[PDB]
Design an enzyme around this catalytic site. Structure first.
Site, PDB file in Angstrom:
ATOM      1  N   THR B   1       0.829  -1.199   0.000  1.00  0.00           N
ATOM      2  CA  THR B   1       0.000   0.000   0.000  1.00  0.00           C
ATOM      3  C   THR B   1       0.868   1.256   0.000  1.00  0.00           C
ATOM      4  O   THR B   1       1.415   1.645   1.033  1.00  0.00           O
ATOM      5  CB  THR B   1      -0.948   0.029   1.216  1.00  0.00           C
ATOM      6  OG1 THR B   1      -1.806  -1.118   1.182  1.00  0.00           O
ATOM      7  CG2 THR B   1      -1.799   1.286   1.199  1.00  0.00           C
ATOM      8  N   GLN B   2       0.993   1.887  -1.169  1.00  0.00           N
ATOM      9  CA  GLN B   2       1.792   3.097  -1.317  1.00  0.00           C
ATOM     10  C   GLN B   2       1.135   4.325  -0.701  1.00  0.00           C
ATOM     11  O   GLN B   2       1.753   5.396  -0.688  1.00  0.00           O
ATOM     12  CB  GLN B   2       2.089   3.351  -2.795  1.00  0.00           C
ATOM     13  CG  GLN B   2       2.947   2.275  -3.439  1.00  0.00           C
ATOM     14  CD  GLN B   2       4.323   2.180  -2.809  1.00  0.00           C
ATOM     15  OE1 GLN B   2       4.584   1.297  -1.992  1.00  0.00           O
ATOM     16  NE2 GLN B   2       5.210   3.095  -3.185  1.00  0.00           N
ATOM     17  N   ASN B   3      -0.090   4.197  -0.197  1.00  0.00           N
ATOM     18  CA  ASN B   3      -0.845   5.277   0.422  1.00  0.00           C
ATOM     19  C   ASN B   3      -0.160   5.715   1.715  1.00  0.00           C
ATOM     20  O   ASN B   3       0.743   5.018   2.198  1.00  0.00           O
ATOM     21  CB  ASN B   3      -2.285   4.823   0.687  1.00  0.00           C
ATOM     22  CG  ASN B   3      -3.047   4.540  -0.592  1.00  0.00           C
ATOM     23  OD1 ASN B   3      -3.680   3.494  -0.733  1.00  0.00           O
ATOM     24  ND2 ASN B   3      -2.992   5.474  -1.536  1.00  0.00           N
ATOM     25  N   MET B   5       0.638   5.326   4.791  1.00  0.00           N
ATOM     26  CA  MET B   5       0.464   4.193   5.689  1.00  0.00           C
ATOM     27  C   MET B   5       1.015   4.471   7.092  1.00  0.00           C
ATOM     28  O   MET B   5       1.059   3.556   7.925  1.00  0.00           O
ATOM     29  CB  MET B   5       1.135   2.964   5.062  1.00  0.00           C
ATOM     30  CG  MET B   5       0.820   1.620   5.689  1.00  0.00           C
ATOM     31  SD  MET B   5      -0.879   1.095   5.404  1.00  0.00           S
ATOM     32  CE  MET B   5      -0.850  -0.512   6.199  1.00  0.00           C
TER      33      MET B   5
END
Lengths: 240, 216
Positions: B1-3, B5
């Site tokens: 998950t590149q969001n 995090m």
């Protein structure tokens, strides 16, 4: 006329003999007892050493279910060693899923559900073991349960399993176990076990005890030999 | 998950005589923003070893949850055996390596301090599975900042004490607070020895701004 050839068949009297025969294996199993107290719960085991070749610690019926929970069993000694992992499943999964320690009732529920699962079919046999489970909690405290081979769960102030039950139970009904502390009664618990003992078949044995309660701050621990010798050598004074 | 995090920051550790000290920052970092100013990123494993991590803080809690069960699994046995930092470093390696094979690895960096068999065993794993042993460890920008300070004193002072350890770390976190944008003055100085893990509370660094007035 072969009504009991399997547990899936009900007798004309309605009594299931196979689960009853599975209890007869428990009725012939060695006797162990444990009793809850205000400070916590104490466990005990009478181990039968047939030959000197047996090393100390062998044939251990004291089980570690979880941090705060121990176990003591009566029946085939390899039965609950499967339930030991099954009890660790609910111990691990609950702490994994819900992120805190499991109460004794919730553990005694699904285990009793798993004991009753094998009474149903004809393709499996019911457990030949019967055990008790104590624990201690901050919101609850010392609780005591027992699961028979049929999977029934009852709450208990005290309980007994193995060969002779009412031999200990009636004596446990005579002496009040309610408000006393496990540290004081652990001396008398051995005396009750020595009363259950008789020398015809069995000759020599040893006592195995465990700790859970306020003395251990809720975390299930194991008793050292010397502190047990304080009860042992005192039980030798009460041996006669 | 590149969001966003909630990634971590640089984690530092170094060996001293008969023990290991591990330092980390208490600032949870959300993207380029600093959101959580108080987080506990360090877990104690028995008295023997202590663990800390960099990168995703969420992936740490899962391992904190999984390894928390793994360590209790021995206490579930009650057989009289323990876990060595080498065994956890071993297991964690294989555990982190099996994740990237499924193309769903935990995105993070981890550091394992510990003491076993009359010796302090420090160990390091990686998101990609790189594992080795070094007298000092630097993660994130600590390799770009704090590591040359360590590699200088290590050859000068192979034997390190707690006073020498702290003074380094105190000056490291001092320089880190200067040159790192995502750092924060609050940090955990945590030590592990043969006597068990002891974690100090939040501390700050000394700032000398004299170079600012000397501009004009």
């Amino acid at each position: 006329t072969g009504y009991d050839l399997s547990a899936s068949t009900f007798s004309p009297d309605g009594r299931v003999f196979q689960v009853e025969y599975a209890m007869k294996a428990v009725e012939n199993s060695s006797t162990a007892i444990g009793i809850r107290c205000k400070d916590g719960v104490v466990f005990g085991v009478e181990k039968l050493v047939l030959s000197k070749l047996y090393e100390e610690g062998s044939n251990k019926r004291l089980f570690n279910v979880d941090r705060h929970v121990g176990m003591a069993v009566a029946g085939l000694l390899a039965d609950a060693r499967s339930l030991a992992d099954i009890a660790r499943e609910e111990a691990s999964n609950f702490r994994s899923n819900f992120g805190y320690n499991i109460p004794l009732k919730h553990l005694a529920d699904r285990v009793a559900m798993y004991v009753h699962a094998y009474t149903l079919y004809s393709a499996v046999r019911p457990f030949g073991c019967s055990f008790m489970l104590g624990s201690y909690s901050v919101n609850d405290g010392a609780q005591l349960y027992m699961i028979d081979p049929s999977g029934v769960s009852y709450g208990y102030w005290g309980c007994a399993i193995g060969k002779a039950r009412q031999a200990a139970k009636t004596e446990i009904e005579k002496l009040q176990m309610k408000e006393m502390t496990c540290r004081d009664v652990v001396k008398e618990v051995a005396k009750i076990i020595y009363i259950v003992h008789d020398e015809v078949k069995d000759k020599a044995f040893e006592l195995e005890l465990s700790w859970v309660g306020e003395i251990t701050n809720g975390r299930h621990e194991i008793v050292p030999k010397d502190v047990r010798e304080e009860a042992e050598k005192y039980a030798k004074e009460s041996l006669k | 998950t590149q969001n966003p995090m909630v990634t971590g920051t640089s984690v530092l550790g170094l060996k001293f005589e008969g023990g290991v000290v591990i330092a980390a920052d208490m600032l949870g970092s959300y993207g380029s923003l600093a959101r959580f100013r108080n987080i506990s990123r360090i877990m104690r494993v028995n008295n023997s070893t202590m663990l800390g991590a960099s990168g995703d803080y969420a992936d740490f809690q899962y391992l904190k949850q999984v390894l928390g069960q793994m360590v209790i699994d021995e206490e579930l046995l009650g057989d009289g055996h323990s876990y060595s930092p080498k065994a956890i470093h071993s297991w964690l390696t294989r555990a982190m390596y099996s994740r990237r094979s499924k193309m769903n690895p935990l995105w993070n960096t981890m550091v394992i301090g510990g003491y076993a068999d009359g010796e302090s065993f420090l160990g390091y794993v990686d998101m990609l599975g790189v594992a080795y042993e070094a007298p000092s460890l630097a993660t994130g920008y600590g390799a770009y900042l704090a590591q040359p300070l360590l590699r200088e004193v290590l050859e000068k002072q192979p034997v390190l004490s707690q006073t020498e350890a702290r003074e380094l770390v105190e000056r490291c976190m001092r320089v880190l607070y200067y040159r790192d944008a995502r750092s924060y003055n609050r940090f955990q100085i945590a030590t592990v020895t043969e006597k068990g893990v002891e974690i100090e509370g939040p501390l700050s660094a000394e700032t000398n701004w004299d170079i600012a007035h000397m501009i004009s």
